[PDB]
Amino acid sequence: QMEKYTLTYFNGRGRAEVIRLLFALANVSYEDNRITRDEWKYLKPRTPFGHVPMLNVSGNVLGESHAIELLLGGRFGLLGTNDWEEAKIMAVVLNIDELFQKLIPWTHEKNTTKKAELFRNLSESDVMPFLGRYEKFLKESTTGHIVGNKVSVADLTVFNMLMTLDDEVKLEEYPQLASFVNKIGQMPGIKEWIKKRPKTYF
Amino acid sequence: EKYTLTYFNGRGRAEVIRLLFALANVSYEDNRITRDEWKYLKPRTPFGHVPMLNVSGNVLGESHAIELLLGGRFGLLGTNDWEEAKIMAVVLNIDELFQKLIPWTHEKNTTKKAELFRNLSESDVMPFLGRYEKFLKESTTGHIVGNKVSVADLTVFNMLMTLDDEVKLEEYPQLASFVNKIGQMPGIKEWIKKRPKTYF
Ligand SMILES: N[C@@H](CCC(=O)N[C@@H](CS)C(=O)NCC(=O)O)C(=O)O
Numbered sequence: 253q254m255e256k257y258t259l260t261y262f263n264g265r266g267r268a269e270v271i272r273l274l275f276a277l278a279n280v281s282y283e284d285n286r287i288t289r290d291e292w293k294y295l296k297p298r299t300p301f302g303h304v305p306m307l308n309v310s311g312n313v314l315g316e317s318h319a320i321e322l323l324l325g326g327r328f329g330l331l332g333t334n335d336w337e338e339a340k341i342m343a344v345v346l347n348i349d350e351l352f353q354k355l356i357p358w359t360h361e362k363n364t365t366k367k368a369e370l371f372r373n374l375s376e377s378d379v380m381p382f383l384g385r386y387e388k389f390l391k392e393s394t395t396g397h398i399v400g401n402k403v404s405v406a407d408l409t410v411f412n413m414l415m416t417l418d419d420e421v422k423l424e425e426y427p428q429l430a431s432f433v434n435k436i437g438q439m440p441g442i443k444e445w446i447k448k449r450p451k452t453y454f
Numbered sequence: 455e456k457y458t459l460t461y462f463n464g465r466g467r468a469e470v471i472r473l474l475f476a477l478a479n480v481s482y483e484d485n486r487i488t489r490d491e492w493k494y495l496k497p498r499t500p501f502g503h504v505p506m507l508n509v510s511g512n513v514l515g516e517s518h519a520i521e522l523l524l525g526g527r528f529g530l531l532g533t534n535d536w537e538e539a540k541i542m543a544v545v546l547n548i549d550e551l552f553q554k555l556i557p558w559t560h561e562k563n564t565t566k567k568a569e570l571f572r573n574l575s576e577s578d579v580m581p582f583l584g585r586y587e588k589f590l591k592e593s594t595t596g597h598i599v600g601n602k603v604s605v606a607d608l609t610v611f612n613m614l615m616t617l618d619d620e621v622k623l624e625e626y627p628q629l630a631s632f633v634n635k636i637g638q639m640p641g642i643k644e645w646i647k648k649r650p651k652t653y654f
């Protein structure tokens with residue numbers, strides 16, 4: 253008997269989307285529970301840390317996006333082939349989290365002038381360093397993976413962030429990242445999920 | 455193995471790693487650098503931060519990735535993948551509280567510092583105490599997760615020590631027993647006595 257997975261998050265990509273990509277890529281079925289703010293009022297105090305995403309695995313509850321990505325990544329064979337690769341994959345995931353956190357105001361700014369200003373102010377300090385970093389990791393990789401020789405949670409995380417930034421970065425100047433984003437995006441499971449998934453502002 | 459930990463001369467985000475080494479009784483080089491040396495070193499780290507771990511010439515960044523690696527090699531991530539993930543959830547949760555406490559830790563004037571803390575008390579510190587008091591009440595053995603000491607215990611212990619002047623554990627008997635129990639464990643106790651005395 254398969255574990256029953258239920259992911260709870262708002263109706264949005266946000267901090268849940270890498271988890272949704274892991275399920276998509278692994279072709280592992282789960283319930284994609286998207287709640288409203290109002291439903292969240294009641295649910296928040298019964299969660300372990302007062303946040304979403306949350307994962308329910310056959311009656312047992314786990315919080316924290318990167319802990320959930322750890323668990324699923326491990327079960328789905330997306331944490332490399334040894335404990336060193338696993339740790340390097342998780343380091344990347346945690347590094348992208350810092351960038352995600354810096355981008356929160358931008359993601360939620362619906363005024364286009366103000367949103368462009370938020371982004372401008374992060375361009376040199378965070379976005380350009382991100383692109384350079386991951387361009388270089390890939391340049392130094394022989395297989396076009398962020399860590400090791402197969403797809404991992406880190407690939408999905410960097411992929412997801414590139415999609416987040418798609419309208420604001422030019423990947424012609426980062427040919428490794430351009431190739432990578434097309435490769436991950438064409439993977440079965442991922443490709444159908446991107447077409448399928450609810451279109452949300454963030 | 456040859457482990458080198460690089461961080462500032464401080465507890466900060468390296469100290470749980472230092473506690474893991476202490477508890478496991480595993481030798482490592484505790485490399486503490488100055489702010490000035492860090493200017494030079496920063497671009498050759500993977501992400502532009504410390505802590506960093508060098509394991510026989512290979513480098514790993516991210517305090518929680520280092521914790522995950524060392525924790526796993528030392529048996530401090532529970533007994534299965536579910537325990538491990540619950541342990542790391544606690545670690546990641548406490549990291550949010552650490553981030554919120556950053557201005558407070560770095561403000562040295564006593565009245566400005568107290569004002570920083572009080573504005574976080576009901577919003578963040580009190581919820582933290584209630585949360586971890588309850589996790590312990592749910593444990594039969596007085597561990598945050600599972601039946602054995604883990605990285606989660608070391609993380610909650612370190613944060614409680616960080617807050618030791620500001621926090622009364624009068625109403626949190628579970629946490630008070632816990633803080634005592636962890637601090638008395640072989641290796642931890644000696645490390646706390648030996649370690650360099652720093653403001654942060
Ligand atoms: N450490 C976290 C933070 C999760 C988080 O801050 N979630 C936000 C949404 S992106 C949330 O639950 N907001 C509603 C609330 O905090 O009440 C994780 O990575 O899961």
Ligand SMILES: N[C@@H](CCC(=O)N[C@@H](CS)C(=O)NCC(=O)O)C(=O)O
Pocket residue numbers: 346347350466467496502503504505515516517518
């Ligand atoms: N995601 C991080 C961040 C580490 C971090 O913010 N380290 C600070 C000291 S607490 C630092 O490297 N400051 C110097 C710098 O960022 O240039 C981790 O958990 O290792």
